[PDB]
A paper describes a structure:
The widely occurring bacterial RNA chaperone Hfq is a key factor in the post‐transcriptional control of hundreds of genes in Pseudomonas aeruginosa. Our results show that these assemblies have mRNA‐specific quaternary architectures resulting from the combination of multivalent protein–protein interfaces and recognition of patterns in the RNA sequence. The structural polymorphism of these ribonucleoprotein assemblies enables selective translational repression of many different target mRNAs.
Three Hfq hexamers (Hfq1–3) present the rbsB 110 mRNA to three Crc molecules (Crc1–3). A similar yet more extensive Hfq‐to‐Hfq presentation of the RNA target is found in the Hfq–rbsB 110–Crc assembly, where a short RNRN motif in the rbsB 110 coding region is presented by the Hfq3 distal side to the Hfq2 rim/proximal side. In particular, Hfq2 residues Arg16, Lys17, and Arg19 form hydrogen bonds with the phosphate backbone and the C6 nucleobase of rbsB 110 (counting from the AUG start codon, with A annotated as nucleotide 1). The Hfq3 rim side can make putative hydrogen bonds with the hairpin backbone via Arg66 and Arg19. Lastly, the hydrogen‐bonding interactions of R90 and Y91 in interface 3 of the rbsB 110 complex were tested with the double mutant R90E and Y91F, and found to have roughly a 2‐fold effect on translational repression.
Numbering used by the authors:
A (entry chain F), D (entry chain B), K (entry chain I), M (entry chain M): 5 to 70
B (entry chain H), H (entry chain N): 1 to 262
C (entry chain O), F (entry chain D), L (entry chain G), N (entry chain K): 6 to 71
E (entry chain C), J (entry chain J): 5 to 69
G (entry chain E), O (entry chain L): 3 to 71
I (entry chain A): 1 to 165, 167 to 262
The structure:
RNA sequence: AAUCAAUACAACGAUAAGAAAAGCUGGAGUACCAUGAAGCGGGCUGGCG
């Protein structure tokens, strides 16, 4: 976990609006409030929990650096 | 109101285009998305900031050698994705295609071989046409919209060239190429951006390297902006300025009732 | 981890949550209990939902974060 | 496994007809004959083994409580 | 594990033709030649290898055990 | 095991095998190399295939078994 | 030996900046060049940076051939 | 060019057919796939190399009892897979169905009960017809093509029999069977390979065991090659000679403008 | 390999059968469970240790009048439970039923009236058939498997008789054939012998006449009715003409099952 | 009591087969060998002991008393 | 005692067909022949003794008055 | 005791109560009378309910507590 | 009752919400208002009375001390 | 009495007995000791069984009656 | 004779604090240690302190063998 | 309209397989029958995996 944890921590700290695409093609949007090893909390209208094993890609709205 | 301006210009070498003032002209046209064809410059060659436009993004692809060919695309907004290549040699090896992915609608540029430099060029052009027809048949099932600003180097109807009787004997207006364009337009459902708002003659885009051709307006409509059938009603205006031009192909400005975003 | 306290808060407060599966089907009900692999979602009929098929957990009202 | 194993054991002992839904949406029906950590053997018209990693929801015909 | 290994062992020893459904809904047919913890060798005209993590369900044509 | 000797026999004899993915699209080529998680499939273009997406490995001709 | 082949392959793909096409399990075709990777995620970038999870990646198809170390 | 030859012959016992010289005749027909019905022999019986054909693979299924027997299928190319039975007792317990999986199109042999030996036989035949109608209604939604070399033991129209006035009073031309075939042909969209290229009479496929039937040509058409609607235009020719034959049914040869491959 | 042998023997009087040598014959058959019907002896009459078999247990029931009916059962293993009766008069008062409960499978002896001894006997037989049909419809919901070694005294098809043109005599009547077809189709029960051999001349009952023995004018009155769960486990089936000790030949059926308690 | 004890005594004296239904619905059959205040010895194949607090009803196979 | 005994005595005297319901739910029918402290004798097709501690409800077929 | 005054208050006020048996059968009506072991529930048909089979008594409206 | 009575008295005085599981399997929740020898008054949405002989386990929401 | 001498006879001879509980669960072993309410059942592990939950006691072999 | 078996057994289990398994009549299995007991209830301690009625306890199975006084 | 006004079953539903939708804030998991089933106890070393 050399890349996942720092990338998610930077996305959380910078509060960058990120778009999360699931495996079935559904597009989620919002800001990452927190995460662990298996779930990622996405905040928008409702603080919904998104499971990692269903997430395909994470697309930030602006570039970020570790 | 939603307004989008797309310009497609084949430069036949971006160096001579920049020397003739093509970049400044494009910067003065207030365009939103610009598609370039036949840049004849590699990625290392385009690294020079002289080709950069103020306030515009730049993405391009190149072949094994710069003189072989290459295309480029400009956009006012950072695209969601920029892709190149189709999956066969005639496009991947020459870098004659570049596609920019935005929200809902994607804008792409395409370069077709001239086919006049020899019989092998015509064979490669026919192979490229067949492969592109197959790709369009596979792609037409998708939901998103596509904008193909492709220099097909072939006229569709007699209204696209002057003296079609002698044009039928030269590459650009051959019967198989005309049938291929008819198939692509009708069977696949693609619509021409220019013909959806203007069905008049003398709207040429390419002229041979002869002063007599320029004098008598013996032009060929080799440049096109191919749109999915979903965007046929979004076309607002289309322009084909004869002069000033900076290559053998005239600029093609087309306006749309669409708001570009990511 | 943060999945366990979030599920505990959803369970103890009897918050009606919507669970979306990986195939896009929308479930509804209240989280009765959970463990490491399954989540028991009860409503008009008590049904067990496996975690590996869950995509998102959407509560009907905002909840306190751990 | 504090919830999955007791729930499946109760469904087995009570012989309750259960509806097992796969991840792709195909509905299965029958009674659970036996199970372990990875598979669930369903009993209906023809005895057929169902893998757990493809099960989405298990909906018994009548409610059960722990 | 507990019963799936004896289940597949019985299906192999009895050579019962079974229908193996995949996760995407595609149905396979044939006999189990051998297996381990991750793959099941479906055996008929072509001895292909089927991964367990893609097998939705195994439906034998006749009851066993 | 069984998967490792099978893939090793397929690689040694260079049998052209067809690999079917979980989404249904069939891949074609010959097995060049493999490890625990990926299988290098060589054809017109060299592509790496993940084992978690491989559904079936169907050779064009019968091969020896362990 | 979990990644005895996948990790060297991804490292070679990253060193030469080869534009690789990554096909997901749902059939969606991604493009770009791999910036970096780890044990579970793959960093892809063509116009904007993007992290891609390995558990959703089906095939990695480079646009040009490569050589194993 | 592309050419496919499929032969369907009901043998009413593979032993008597082999004793009459069926294999020696099939070896010279240059067919690609041979479908046999009513083998009346177990799978262990066909293991004998006497029934083997040079250049053909042997796959077959058998019932619980050898008297009912099963169906066999020969193929030149090794099929992708071999499947048998439909999922119900009157086909599974009797093994009256066998299907070989090829690319795009799959060939399947089918055997229906005679229905003339007692009312129970007719009831079982009607149950089999209903279950097969359900299966075809469920299967017609698929994309791949199906070729059913099925001995239905049921005539379709008056042109398929001789003296239909007396045929209506015997199993083979009853009202329910005719309605069943009409439903299968019209509502489900399945076509008959023989009628797609030849709409002529006297092309009977079965004759009663009597010298008067052979002399007076009182034959019935019990054999058919049911095809999906996608292959109705690919039928090239159909051959069904009156003699020689090795059972109560005549050999049915049908050619297609299709290349069989795996 | 799992192997279980069940023998059903209608004796029409167990005393005459024992006098003819039924016990010495059964001792050598190596069967696991023996089914006897129409013993025509009370429970006190069978208490005599002469009828006992070496290594076999003995359970039986009797009617109010022992000469009218009564069945028996032998077993190599001690069954979990021994029950009798169905819940109606034609079975309870006549003692024509005895069921031994084993693991997973239940073996039950059954006896139907002859129906040839008058119109009253035929009506009693029809009532018994209807009541047993109701019982089977109620019982088919259970999970445990049932083996009904019942001499129903009715043939099923023409293959079970000789010179069927039988239809005018009790044993092959139209309503009885319809009842058997209903039982074997709607209820889902499978005949033990017909699941492995569809051959003729395998009769089980012969009229008391030399012509019936010489010309083989026999009827199949013996059956082993199996639940649909046990139709696949039938291994062998036989109906030896001799040395039967009554008007019914012994029906030996083998199963791919290991009996346990 | 005044009714249960004479009933069970008549049942055991006449050796009438009785159907004993338990609380869960499972029916037992046999002959009552002996009884007391809490248990009823139900004898047939094996002399099992049945507790009264779990018996729902006792149904004799024939009328008594 | 103040209500149970008089109710049962009235049911026995009036010979009203009562529907006995057991704790598990198996309904019995018949007429009350006799009773005491722990058992209830119900007669219908055959006289059967019903234990009191297994009875749930008693439903007469017609109204009664004490 | 508290059961006796509670039941007496329910009786004198004629509050419709729902009685859930030990198995789970829901009975409805009004309490007419009771004693130490049985409870008389009257509705469309008069029925006697035994106390050893009653699990919960749920009135339709709040009542005074002893 | 040396243990049940003081425990129930402490739970009543502390007014701790308790979870009560019946013998039929269902769980009831509420607050203990009062109790005696045979019934327990459980107050929540409706003031329902629960019998002691039908209560299997008592689960307080938080640990208590005698 | 009958229950106590019967249990004492079962205990003295160490006869393996099968004890079917009221819910249908079957136990196996030998009787260590007993009293008025519980029976000590010996097996792989020593366990205690309550008499109020035992439905039947079925020895594996016949024994002398008290 | 009274509770000469139940009381000493439960007292030994309480003093030794051996984890015991308590099976209910409805099929639910409980685990924990007994804090104390009386004539009608048993105090069970695990994640939370819960009281179990004796009239619903079917069997009490210790996790390890024990010796009675 | 809910702990089955009292017991419990059946009712039909999976493309031998698309060289691959830069991605749709989310597709759906009826009637009828039916009153007691000889009984289904799920590793390393308390620290960790």
């Amino acid at each position: 976990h050399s890349l996942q944890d720092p990338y998610l921590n930077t996305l959380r700290k910078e509060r960058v609006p990120v778009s999360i695409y699931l495996v079935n093609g559904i597009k989620l949007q919002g800001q990452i409030e927190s995460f662990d090893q298996f779930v990622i909390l996405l905040k928008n209208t409702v603080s919904q929990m998104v499971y990692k094993h269903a997430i395909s890609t994470v697309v930030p709205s602006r570039p970020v650096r570790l | 109101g939603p307004a989008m301006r797309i310009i497609s210009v084949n430069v036949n070498g971006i160096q001579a285009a920049a020397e003739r003032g093509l970049l400044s002209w494009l910067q003065a046209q207030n365009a939103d998305v610009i598609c370039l064809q036949d840049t004849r410059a590699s990625a290392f060659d385009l690294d020079d900031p002289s080709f950069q436009l103020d306030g515009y993004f730049l993405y391009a692809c190149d072949a094994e050698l710069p003189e072989q060919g290459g295309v480029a695309l400009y956009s006012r907004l950072q695209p969601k994705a920029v892709i190149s290549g189709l999956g066969f040699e005639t496009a991947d090896r020459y870098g004659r295609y570049l596609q920019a992915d935005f929200d809902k609608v994607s804008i792409a540029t395409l370069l077709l071989p001239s086919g006049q430099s020899g019989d092998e060029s015509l064979n490669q052009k026919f192979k490229f046409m067949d492969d592109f027809t197959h790709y369009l048949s596979k792609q037409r099932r998708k939901r998103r919209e596509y904008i193909y600003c492709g220099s097909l180097y072939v006229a569709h109807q007699k209204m696209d060239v002057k003296n079609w009787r002698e044009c039928q004997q030269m590459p650009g207006f051959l019967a198989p190429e005309r049938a291929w364009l008819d198939e692509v337009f009708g069977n696949l459902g693609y619509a021409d951006a220019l013909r959806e708002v203007s069905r008049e003659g003398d709207q040429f885009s390419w002229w041979p390297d002869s002063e007599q051709a320029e004098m008598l307006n013996l032009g060929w409509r080799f440049d096109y902006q191919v749109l999915t059938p979903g965007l046929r009603r979004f076309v607002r205006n289309a322009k084909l300025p004869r002069q000033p031009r900076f290559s053998q192909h005239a600029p093609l400005i087309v306006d749309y009732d669409w708001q570009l975003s990511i």
